[model samples]
Target: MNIFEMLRIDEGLRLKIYKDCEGYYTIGIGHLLTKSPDLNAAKSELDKAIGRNCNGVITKDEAEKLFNQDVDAAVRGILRNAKLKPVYDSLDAVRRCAAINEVFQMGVTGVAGFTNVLRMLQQKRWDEAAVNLAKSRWYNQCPDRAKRVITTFRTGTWDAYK
Candidate 1:
């Protein structure tokens, strides 16, 4: 499965604004508009997207646009990281999508903090990489997605699709 398909399943589509598990204001396939710190700005942005004064609802096309933007940002973030670039380059297409998914969920800084995981991945020690990934707090936050990601890493397959 491609990253978009995998993310569509993992993130799930929502045409309305809702609070994520972490309480962030999220919309349209995990597009986090903002947290409390920037609530008003997010609301205005949402209003702009829907072309109205802050309604809860969004269009499917708008959500898809946001999803694509978020995915592109995640991919660019992964590529821009000096430490992550080589490790990402070492991965096969499936493993690459797994990495992108993780980065998309947790941003580059969060993924970059997985030093041991990155090293293990760089060396293609799949089991070790998966083990290290499972030990993260992110695993606790989203155990199901984390499990699939870890499996993808270990088996070099699109476990998320399964």
Candidate 2:
């Protein structure tokens, strides 16, 4: 039905991280990029998301859709870049003794992802931990600002997103 014809991503810009939409240099990438799946995995996944699924969308209405065509694309791109984690000892703690146990479980799950980060921070091993984290983020997002933030946080400051 060509319903998603409007939000379709420009194949040429699929590799781009920012778009000058309506006079603003906006990062339309999805929130998923901040964590999980890591960039490489997500990008590999997106190489095949060439089209959108219409099974659940309203269709055949003879009307136009009003959502950002590439929003989904942006989300996919974000997820591709969002590979971060902390080594969680046990998230089972969160779900234990209360419905909030899941929180403990998930928090502990981070221990797995944040292993290097925690060790580095604990031993003040900022140099090594920050290096890996920075490299990982840069490789995924290709942004100088993110790189700068990683560096800044490594200098004895636990402020930025590790």
Candidate 3:
């Protein structure tokens, strides 16, 4: 399949906003409700058509389309952050993908709270990062996913994240 075909299938469809297991507002496929800020803003400006307050039912195609931009921008945000840039550069592709998805799952502001975790990751201290991950509320909120992220962070294996 072409990149577009494969990319479209990555996230499942969701018709409306729902609190994810961790209680973050999420909708469409993987679109987190967190908006990113412009340069100075910790989070960016809201996309006109979508925001934390917006919610409604949608088709699979609609959800997929929305997530395409939402998740992409989230990943881009994570990659672009001056603080996170080191972590992204230090990690392997699989670990980097898992790390980016962590930003998507936790939102940039939420993930930023893990100061030690980010520091460990930036230093390529995977074991320390995993330990830090395990200590966070994210670990208590969803141990299954926390384990997966910790393992993947430690191993740099995408399969571990699954």
Candidate 4:
């Protein structure tokens, strides 16, 4: 009977709204009802479908409204925990992770490293780029950034990343 009514989203997908926001959107009877990013919004979007469903009518605005709500709430929660200091929240996250022997990119290390690697490789300093990549842990994880460095050094083309 309705588009949103036809589509169904599960709880697992429910929690990953921020991660897979596009897929998390809901279309209700060809009209976007509620959005994702929260259990309440997901429930509202699905509720609009009731008995009918439309899938493609999902709207980006709805998704943003839903996700941003979660961001606001999370920030508020962190602020409360950090005595209203944004820097304190970030430092807490970094130090907590570090104390547990976790990876901590506390600042702009990732961006700095990727940039340096690209510049070095472009200057034909393969050794330095590799070292830079190793230092930042981008060699194994940050493919796009890593590739930019390699490609810039090799042929001044993005394709050279491979």
Deviation from native of the Cα of residue 105 in model 2, angstroms: 21
What are the per-residue Cα lDDT tens digits for candidate 4 across 1-162? 111111111111232222222233433211223434565665455445343242323345544444444334434443453222333233333222111111111122233335565455345565675566556544355343243343333332333222
Cα displacement (Å) at residue 121, model 1: 0.3
**Superposing all C-alpha atoms, what RMSD in Å does each candidate have to the true structure?**
1.9, 14.2, 6.4, 14.9
What are the per-model numbers of colliding residue pairs?
0, 28, 4, 15
Residue 96's lDDT in candidate 4: 22
The alpha-carbon lDDT assigned to residue 99 of candidate 1 equals: 91
Report residue 42 deviation for candidate 4 (angstroms).
16
Would you list the C-alpha lDDT of every candidate in the order shown?
A: 0.84, 0.31, 0.63, 0.34
Model 2 TM: 0.29
Whose lDDT is greatest here?
1
Per lDDT, what order, best first?
A: 1, 3, 4, 2
**Candidate 2 at 91: error in angstroms?**
21
Most accurate candidate by TM-score? 1
lDDT of 2: 0.31
Model 2, 9-94: lDDT tens digits are 21112222232221222222221212332444444333333234222122222112212334433333323432222212221221
Would you estimate the TM-scores of all the predictions? 0.90, 0.29, 0.72, 0.24
Residue-level lDDT for 80 in candidate 4: 52
